[PDB]
Coordinates of C-alpha atoms in Angstrom, one line a residue:
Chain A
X1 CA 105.4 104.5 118.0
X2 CA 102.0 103.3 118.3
X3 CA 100.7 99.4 117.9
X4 CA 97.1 98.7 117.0
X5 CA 95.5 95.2 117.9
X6 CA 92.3 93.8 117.0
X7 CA 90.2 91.1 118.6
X8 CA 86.9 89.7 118.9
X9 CA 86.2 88.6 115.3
X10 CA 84.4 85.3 115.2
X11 CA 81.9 83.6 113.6
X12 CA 78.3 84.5 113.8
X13 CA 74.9 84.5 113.5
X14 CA 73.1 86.4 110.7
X15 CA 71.3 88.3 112.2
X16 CA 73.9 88.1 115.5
X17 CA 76.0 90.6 117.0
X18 CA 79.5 91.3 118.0
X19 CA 82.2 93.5 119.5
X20 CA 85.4 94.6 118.0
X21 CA 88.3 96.0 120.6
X22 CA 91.2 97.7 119.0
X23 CA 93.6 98.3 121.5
X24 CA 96.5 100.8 121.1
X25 CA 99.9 100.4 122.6
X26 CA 102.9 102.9 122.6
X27 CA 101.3 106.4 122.7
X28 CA 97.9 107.8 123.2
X29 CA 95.7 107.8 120.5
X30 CA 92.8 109.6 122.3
X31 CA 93.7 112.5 120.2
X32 CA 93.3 110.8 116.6
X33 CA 90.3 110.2 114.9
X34 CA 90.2 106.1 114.6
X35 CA 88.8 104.4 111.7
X36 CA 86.9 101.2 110.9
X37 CA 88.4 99.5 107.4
X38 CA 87.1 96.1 106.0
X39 CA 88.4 93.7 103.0
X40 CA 86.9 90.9 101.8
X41 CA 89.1 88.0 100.7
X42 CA 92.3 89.9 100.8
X43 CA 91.4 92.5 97.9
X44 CA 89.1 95.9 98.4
X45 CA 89.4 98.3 100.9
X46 CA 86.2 99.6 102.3
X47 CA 85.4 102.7 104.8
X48 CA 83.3 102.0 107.5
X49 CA 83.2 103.9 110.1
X50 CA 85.0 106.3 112.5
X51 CA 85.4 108.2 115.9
X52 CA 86.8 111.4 116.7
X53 CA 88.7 112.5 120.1
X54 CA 85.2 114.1 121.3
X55 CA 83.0 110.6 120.9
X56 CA 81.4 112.3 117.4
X57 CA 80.8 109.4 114.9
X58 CA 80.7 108.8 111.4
X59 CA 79.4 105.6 109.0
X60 CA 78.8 104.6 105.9
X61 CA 75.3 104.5 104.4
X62 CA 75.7 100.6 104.4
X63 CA 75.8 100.0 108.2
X64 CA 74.5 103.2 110.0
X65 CA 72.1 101.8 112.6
X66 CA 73.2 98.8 112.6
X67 CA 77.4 99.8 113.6
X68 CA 78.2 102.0 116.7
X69 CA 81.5 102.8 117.2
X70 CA 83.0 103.9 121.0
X71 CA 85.8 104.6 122.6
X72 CA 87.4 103.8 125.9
X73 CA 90.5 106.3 126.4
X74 CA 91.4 105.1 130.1
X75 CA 92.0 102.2 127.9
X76 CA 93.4 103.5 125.1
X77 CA 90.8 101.5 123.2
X78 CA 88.0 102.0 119.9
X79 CA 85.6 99.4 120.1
X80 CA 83.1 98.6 117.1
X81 CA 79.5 97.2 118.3
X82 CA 77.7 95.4 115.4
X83 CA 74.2 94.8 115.4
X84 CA 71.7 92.6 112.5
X85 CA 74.8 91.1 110.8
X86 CA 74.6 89.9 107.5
X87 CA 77.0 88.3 105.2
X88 CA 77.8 90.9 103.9
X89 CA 79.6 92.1 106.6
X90 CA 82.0 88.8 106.5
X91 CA 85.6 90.3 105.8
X92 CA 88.9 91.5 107.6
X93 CA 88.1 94.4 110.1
X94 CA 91.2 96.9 110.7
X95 CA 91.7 99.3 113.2
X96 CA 93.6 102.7 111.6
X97 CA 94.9 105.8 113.5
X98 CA 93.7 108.7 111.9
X99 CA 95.3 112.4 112.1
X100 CA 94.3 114.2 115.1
X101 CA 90.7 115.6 115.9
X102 CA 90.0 119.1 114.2
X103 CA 93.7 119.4 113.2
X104 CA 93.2 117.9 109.4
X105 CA 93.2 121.8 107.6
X106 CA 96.3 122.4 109.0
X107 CA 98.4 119.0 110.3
X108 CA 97.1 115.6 107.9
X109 CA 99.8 113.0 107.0
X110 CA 98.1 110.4 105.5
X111 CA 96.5 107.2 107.3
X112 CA 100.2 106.0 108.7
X113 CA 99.3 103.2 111.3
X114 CA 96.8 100.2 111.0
X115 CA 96.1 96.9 112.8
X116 CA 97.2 93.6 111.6
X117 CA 92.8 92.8 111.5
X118 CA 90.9 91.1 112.8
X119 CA 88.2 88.6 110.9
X120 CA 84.2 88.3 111.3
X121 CA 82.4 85.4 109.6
X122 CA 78.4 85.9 109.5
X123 CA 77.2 82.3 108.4
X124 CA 75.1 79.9 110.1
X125 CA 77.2 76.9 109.2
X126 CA 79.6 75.2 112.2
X127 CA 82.7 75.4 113.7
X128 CA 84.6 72.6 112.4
X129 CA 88.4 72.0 113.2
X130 CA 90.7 70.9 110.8
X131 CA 92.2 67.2 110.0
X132 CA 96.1 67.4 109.1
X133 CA 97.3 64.6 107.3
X134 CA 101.2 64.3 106.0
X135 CA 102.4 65.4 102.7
X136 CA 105.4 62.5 102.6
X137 CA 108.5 63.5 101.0
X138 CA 108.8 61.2 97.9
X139 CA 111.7 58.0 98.4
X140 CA 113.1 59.4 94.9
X145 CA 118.6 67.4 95.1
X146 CA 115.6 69.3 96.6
X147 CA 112.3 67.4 98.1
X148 CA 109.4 68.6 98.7
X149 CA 106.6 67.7 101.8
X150 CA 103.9 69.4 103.5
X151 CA 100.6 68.9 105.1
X152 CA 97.4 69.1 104.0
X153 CA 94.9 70.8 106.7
X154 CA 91.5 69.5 105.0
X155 CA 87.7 70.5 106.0
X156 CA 87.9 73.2 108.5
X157 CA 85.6 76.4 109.1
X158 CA 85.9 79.1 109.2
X159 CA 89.0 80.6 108.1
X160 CA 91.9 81.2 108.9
X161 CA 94.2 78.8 109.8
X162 CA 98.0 79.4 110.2
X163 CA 100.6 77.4 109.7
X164 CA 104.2 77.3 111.0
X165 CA 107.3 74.7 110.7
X166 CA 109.5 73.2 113.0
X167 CA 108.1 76.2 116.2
X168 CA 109.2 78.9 113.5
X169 CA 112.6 77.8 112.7
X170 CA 112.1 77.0 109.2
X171 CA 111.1 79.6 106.8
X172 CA 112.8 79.4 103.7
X173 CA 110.8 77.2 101.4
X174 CA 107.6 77.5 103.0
X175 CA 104.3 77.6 100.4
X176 CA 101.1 77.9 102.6
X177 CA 98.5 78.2 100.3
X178 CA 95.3 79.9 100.2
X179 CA 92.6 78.2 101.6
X180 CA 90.1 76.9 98.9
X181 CA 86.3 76.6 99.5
X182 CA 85.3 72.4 99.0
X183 CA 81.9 71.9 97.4
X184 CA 81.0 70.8 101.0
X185 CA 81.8 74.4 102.5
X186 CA 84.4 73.5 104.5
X187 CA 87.8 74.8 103.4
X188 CA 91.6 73.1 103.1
X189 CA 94.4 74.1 102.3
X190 CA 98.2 72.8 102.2
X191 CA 101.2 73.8 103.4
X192 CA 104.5 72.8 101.7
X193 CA 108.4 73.3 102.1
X194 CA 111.2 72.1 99.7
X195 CA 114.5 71.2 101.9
X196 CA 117.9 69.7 100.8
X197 CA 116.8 65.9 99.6
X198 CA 120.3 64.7 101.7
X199 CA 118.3 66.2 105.0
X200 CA 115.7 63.8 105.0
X201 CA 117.2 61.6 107.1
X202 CA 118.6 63.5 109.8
X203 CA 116.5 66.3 110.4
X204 CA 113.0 66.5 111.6
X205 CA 109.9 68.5 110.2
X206 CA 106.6 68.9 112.1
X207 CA 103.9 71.2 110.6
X208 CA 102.5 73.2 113.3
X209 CA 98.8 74.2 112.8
X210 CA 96.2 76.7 114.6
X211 CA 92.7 76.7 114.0
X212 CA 92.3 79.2 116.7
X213 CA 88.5 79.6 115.3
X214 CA 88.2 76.0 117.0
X215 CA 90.7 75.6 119.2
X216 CA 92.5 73.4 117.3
X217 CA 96.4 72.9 117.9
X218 CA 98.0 69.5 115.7
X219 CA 102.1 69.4 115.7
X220 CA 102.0 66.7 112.5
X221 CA 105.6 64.9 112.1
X222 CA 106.2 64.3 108.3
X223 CA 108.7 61.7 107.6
X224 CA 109.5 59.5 104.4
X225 CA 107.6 56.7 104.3
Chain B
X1 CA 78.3 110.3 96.9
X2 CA 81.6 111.2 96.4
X3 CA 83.2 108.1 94.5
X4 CA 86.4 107.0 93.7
X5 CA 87.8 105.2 90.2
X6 CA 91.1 103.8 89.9
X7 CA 92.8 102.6 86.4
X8 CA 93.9 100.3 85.4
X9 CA 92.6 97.6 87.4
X10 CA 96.0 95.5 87.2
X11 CA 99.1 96.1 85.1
X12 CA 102.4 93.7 84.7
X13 CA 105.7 95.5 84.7
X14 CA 109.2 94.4 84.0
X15 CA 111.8 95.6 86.8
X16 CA 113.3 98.1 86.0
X17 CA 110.5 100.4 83.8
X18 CA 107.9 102.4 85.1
X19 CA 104.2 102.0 86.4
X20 CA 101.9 104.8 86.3
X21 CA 98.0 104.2 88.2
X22 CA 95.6 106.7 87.9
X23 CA 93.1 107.7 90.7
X24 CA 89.8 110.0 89.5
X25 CA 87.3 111.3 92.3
X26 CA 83.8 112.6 91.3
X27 CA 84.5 116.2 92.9
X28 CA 87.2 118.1 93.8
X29 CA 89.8 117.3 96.3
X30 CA 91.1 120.6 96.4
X31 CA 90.3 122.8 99.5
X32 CA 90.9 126.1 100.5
X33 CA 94.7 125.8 101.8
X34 CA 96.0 124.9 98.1
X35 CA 96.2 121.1 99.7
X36 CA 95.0 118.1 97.9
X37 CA 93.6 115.6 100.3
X38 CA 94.1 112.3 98.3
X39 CA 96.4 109.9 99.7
X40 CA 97.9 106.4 98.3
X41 CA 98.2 103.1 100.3
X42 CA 99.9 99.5 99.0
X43 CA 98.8 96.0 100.4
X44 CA 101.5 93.6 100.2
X45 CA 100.9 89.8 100.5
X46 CA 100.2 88.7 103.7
X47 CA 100.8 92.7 105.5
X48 CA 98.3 95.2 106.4
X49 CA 98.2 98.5 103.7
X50 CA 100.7 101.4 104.2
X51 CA 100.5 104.8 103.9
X52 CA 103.0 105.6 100.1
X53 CA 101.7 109.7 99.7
X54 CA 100.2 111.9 101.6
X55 CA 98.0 115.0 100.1
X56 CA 98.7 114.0 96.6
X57 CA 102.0 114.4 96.0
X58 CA 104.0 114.1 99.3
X59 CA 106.1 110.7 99.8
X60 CA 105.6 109.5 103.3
X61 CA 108.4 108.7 106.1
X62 CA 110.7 105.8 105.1
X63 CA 108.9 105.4 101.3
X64 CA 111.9 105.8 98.1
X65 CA 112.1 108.1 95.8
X66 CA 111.1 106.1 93.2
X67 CA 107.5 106.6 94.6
X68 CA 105.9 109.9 93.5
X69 CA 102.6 111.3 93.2
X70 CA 101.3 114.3 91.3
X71 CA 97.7 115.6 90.0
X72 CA 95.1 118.6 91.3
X73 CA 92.1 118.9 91.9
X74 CA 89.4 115.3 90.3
X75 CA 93.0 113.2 88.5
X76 CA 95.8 111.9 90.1
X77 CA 98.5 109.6 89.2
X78 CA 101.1 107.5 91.3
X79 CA 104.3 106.9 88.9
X80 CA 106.8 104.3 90.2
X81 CA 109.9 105.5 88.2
X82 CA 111.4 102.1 88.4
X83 CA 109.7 98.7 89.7
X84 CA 111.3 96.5 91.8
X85 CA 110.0 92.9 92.5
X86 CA 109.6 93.9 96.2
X87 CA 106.0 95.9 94.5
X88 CA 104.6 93.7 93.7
X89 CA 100.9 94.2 95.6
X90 CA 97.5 96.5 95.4
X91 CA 97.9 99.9 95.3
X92 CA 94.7 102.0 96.5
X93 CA 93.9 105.5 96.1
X94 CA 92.2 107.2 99.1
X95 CA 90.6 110.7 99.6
X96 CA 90.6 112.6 102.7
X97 CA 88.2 115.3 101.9
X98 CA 85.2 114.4 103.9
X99 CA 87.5 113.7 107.0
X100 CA 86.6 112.0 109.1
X101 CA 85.0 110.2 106.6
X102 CA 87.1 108.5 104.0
X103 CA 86.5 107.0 100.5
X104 CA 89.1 104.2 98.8
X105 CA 89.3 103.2 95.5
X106 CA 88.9 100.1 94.2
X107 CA 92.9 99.2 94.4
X108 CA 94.9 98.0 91.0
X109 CA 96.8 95.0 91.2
X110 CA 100.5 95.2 90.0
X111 CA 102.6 92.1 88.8
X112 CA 105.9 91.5 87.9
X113 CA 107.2 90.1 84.4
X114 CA 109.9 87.8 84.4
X115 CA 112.1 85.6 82.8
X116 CA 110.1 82.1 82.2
X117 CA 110.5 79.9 84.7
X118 CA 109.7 76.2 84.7
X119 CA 108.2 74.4 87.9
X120 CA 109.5 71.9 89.7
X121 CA 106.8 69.0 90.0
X122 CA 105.6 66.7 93.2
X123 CA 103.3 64.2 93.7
X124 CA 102.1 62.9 97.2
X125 CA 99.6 60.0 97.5
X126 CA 97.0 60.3 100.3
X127 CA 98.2 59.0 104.0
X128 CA 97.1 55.8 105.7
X129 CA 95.7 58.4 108.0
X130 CA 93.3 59.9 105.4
X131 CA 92.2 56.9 103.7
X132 CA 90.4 55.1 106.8
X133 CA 88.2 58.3 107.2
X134 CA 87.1 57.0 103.5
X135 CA 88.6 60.1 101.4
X136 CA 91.4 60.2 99.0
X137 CA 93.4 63.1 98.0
X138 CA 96.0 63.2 95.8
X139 CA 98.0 66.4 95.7
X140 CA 100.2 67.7 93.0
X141 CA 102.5 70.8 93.7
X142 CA 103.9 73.2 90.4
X143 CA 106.8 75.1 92.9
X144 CA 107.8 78.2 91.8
X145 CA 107.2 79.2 88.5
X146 CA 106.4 82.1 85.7
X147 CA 103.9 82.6 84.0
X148 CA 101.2 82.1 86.1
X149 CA 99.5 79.8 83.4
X150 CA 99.7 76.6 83.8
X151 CA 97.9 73.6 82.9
X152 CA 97.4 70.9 85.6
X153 CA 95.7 67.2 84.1
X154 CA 94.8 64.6 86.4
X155 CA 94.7 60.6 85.2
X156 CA 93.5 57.9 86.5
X157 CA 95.0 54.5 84.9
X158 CA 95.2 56.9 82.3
X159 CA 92.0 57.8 82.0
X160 CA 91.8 61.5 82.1
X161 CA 89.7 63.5 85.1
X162 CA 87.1 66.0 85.4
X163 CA 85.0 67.4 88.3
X164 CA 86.7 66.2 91.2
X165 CA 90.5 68.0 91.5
X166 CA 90.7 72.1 92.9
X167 CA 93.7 74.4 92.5
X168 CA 95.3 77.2 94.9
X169 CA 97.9 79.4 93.5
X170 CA 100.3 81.7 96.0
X171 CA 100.7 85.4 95.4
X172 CA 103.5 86.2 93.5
X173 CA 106.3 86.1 95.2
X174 CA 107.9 89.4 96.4
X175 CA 111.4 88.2 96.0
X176 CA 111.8 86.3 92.8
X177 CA 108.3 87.4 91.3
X178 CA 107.3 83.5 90.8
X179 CA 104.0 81.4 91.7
X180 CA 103.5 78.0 93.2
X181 CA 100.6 76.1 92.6
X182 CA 98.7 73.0 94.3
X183 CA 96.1 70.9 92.4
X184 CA 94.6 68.2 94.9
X185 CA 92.2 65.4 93.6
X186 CA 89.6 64.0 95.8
X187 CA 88.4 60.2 95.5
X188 CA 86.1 58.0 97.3
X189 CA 87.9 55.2 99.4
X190 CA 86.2 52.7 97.2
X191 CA 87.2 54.8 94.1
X192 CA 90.7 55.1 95.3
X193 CA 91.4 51.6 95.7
X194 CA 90.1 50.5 92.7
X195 CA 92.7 51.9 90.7
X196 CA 97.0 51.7 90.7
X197 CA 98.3 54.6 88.4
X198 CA 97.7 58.1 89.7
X199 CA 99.6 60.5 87.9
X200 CA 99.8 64.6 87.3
X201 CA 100.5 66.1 84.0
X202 CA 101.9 69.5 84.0
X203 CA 101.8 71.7 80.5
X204 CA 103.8 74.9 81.1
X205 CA 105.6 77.3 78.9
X206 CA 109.2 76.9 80.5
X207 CA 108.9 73.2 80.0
X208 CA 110.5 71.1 77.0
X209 CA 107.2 68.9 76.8
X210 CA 104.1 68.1 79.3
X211 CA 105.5 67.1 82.8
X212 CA 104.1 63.9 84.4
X213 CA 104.9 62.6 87.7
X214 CA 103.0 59.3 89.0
X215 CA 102.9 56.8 91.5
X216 CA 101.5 53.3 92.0
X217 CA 98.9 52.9 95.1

């Protein structure tokens, strides 16, 4: 079984540049075509470009001189060199294993294995990393708290509660774009009221986009 | 340019009945070998897409029966004989024909009708923390409910608000096909401290009357 990862999406420039690595794990894909697939804001699925086993390429209309797609198979690696970004080309970036080179007339099973993706942000506005303030569970069954991760950029930010451990319940919402253009978000859980005073919840956030790491402890006031 | 046309763009389906999405290409997917290279991905929340049918009509590894594809040719149509909440995502059509270039479609959105459901309501004040950086938020969460419609009123020492609250809503969810939702309202330090009564007031279909939780600063 093969594993795709992406890396290297970050915010940039317009105008800027930047390299995308997909790396493959498992098997070879040196065989397989490899494909370049953006999305914008979670909905949309756009082509973009592509390499076959022999180093031949393929774009769309929309970034042909500006794209260049390589490979690396000691590496088992695709790599995607953009050039003159604009923000237009701000979305999710996957990586997809295509069928193998030549072989599509006679052996094609569909598009079966893509990377988790990996996202670009062309803007010229900062890195800011987030503030995380407490969401206190109300002194009044099932309770509700959270955290609120306010004024960050770019996206994303992920958050996690108590290292993982607790799932059920979670709510972390989309982020939402402030007037500012800085984005927030919150992140909430509903837990058995009578646990409130014997168990402890800490919010866990990344802003890997700025290095930002916050455990928050969220206790009834 | 070869293009690609999906409908409908979303549809809402009751577990249990069927779902039928239709995928048109501009020319022919058809080639010589009888084959027709148009596949079908879904996007769940929060997952990258997956491969549902290969070459029009061929259900890929692990995907149920209750998947199937059929068409020739420019029309094609994914049928899910019975919906299950577990669905519930984008479904995008794809052709193959130009391999190794690729063309999607623009992806249809499918939702899942329940039973109404009411929310349950929250209110959180802003934190010491917050308020010496000289903002105020005040969040109000609506936790898992259905319909997605829902009306969220902010007041003020009961004066009503405008301009300065924003909403998020969750994807539905894949297991009990219901949406939370988060209004936050945003004041001034100054502003905030000028007034006691903060309250929420939540107008939803699976509730008796309007909803309003409140707190004192």
């Amino acid at each position: 079984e093969v594993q795709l990862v992406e890396s290297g999406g970050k915010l940039v420039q317009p105008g800027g540049s930047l390299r995308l690595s997909c790396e493959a794990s498992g098997e070879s894909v040196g065989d397989n075509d490899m494909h370049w697939v953006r999305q914008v804001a979670g909905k949309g699925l756009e082509w973009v470009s592509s390499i076959g086993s022999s180093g031949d390429t393929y774009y769309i209309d929309a970034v042909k001189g500006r794209f260049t797609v390589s490979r690396d198979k000691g590496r088992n690696s695709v790599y995607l060199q953009m050039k003159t970004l604009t923000v237009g080309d701000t979305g999710v970036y996957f990586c997809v294993r295509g069928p193998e080179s030549g072989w599509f007339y006679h052996y094609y099973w569909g598009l079966g294995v893509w990377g988790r993706g990996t996202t670009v942000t062309v803007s010229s506005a900062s890195t800011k990393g987030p503030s995380v303030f407490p969401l206190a569970p109300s002194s009044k069954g099932t309770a509700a708290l959270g955290c609120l991760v306010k004024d960050y950029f770019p996206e994303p930010v992920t958050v996690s509660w108590n290292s993982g451990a607790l799932t059920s319940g979670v709510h972390t919402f989309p982020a939402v774009l402030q007037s500012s253009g800085l984005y927030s978000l919150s992140s909430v859980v509903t837990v058995p009221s009578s646990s409130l005073g014997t168990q402890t919840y800490i919010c866990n956030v990344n802003h890997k986009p700025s290095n930002t790491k916050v455990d928050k402890r969220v206790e009834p006031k | 340019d070869l293009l690609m046309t999906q409908s409908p763009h979303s549809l809402a389906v009751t577990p249990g009945e069927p779902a039928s999405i239709s995928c048109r290409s501009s020319q022919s997917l058809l080639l010589g070998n009888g084959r027709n290279y148009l596949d079908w991905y879904v996007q769940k929340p929060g997952q990258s897409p997956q491969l549902l049918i290969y070459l029009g009509s061929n259900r890929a590894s692990g995907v149920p029966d209750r998947f199937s594809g059929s068409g020739s040719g420019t029309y094609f149509t994914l049928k899910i004989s019975r919906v299950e909440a577990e669905d519930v995502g984008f479904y995008y059509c794809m052709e193959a024909r130009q391999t190794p270039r690729l063309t999607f479609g623009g992806g249809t959105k499918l939702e899942i009708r329940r039973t109404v459901a009411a929310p349950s309501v929250f209110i959180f004040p802003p934190s010491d923390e917050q308020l010496k950086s000289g903002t105020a938020s005040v969040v109000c969460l609506l936790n898992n409910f259905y319909p997605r419609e829902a009306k969220v009123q902010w007041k003020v020492d009961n004066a009503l608000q405008s301009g300065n609250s924003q909403e998020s809503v969750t994807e539905q969810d894949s297991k009990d096909s219901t949406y939370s939702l988060s209004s936050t309202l945003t004041l001034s330090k100054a502003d905030y401290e000028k007034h006691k009564v903060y309250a929420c007031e939540v107008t939803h279909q699976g509730l008796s009357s309007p909803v309003t939780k409140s707190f004192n600063r």
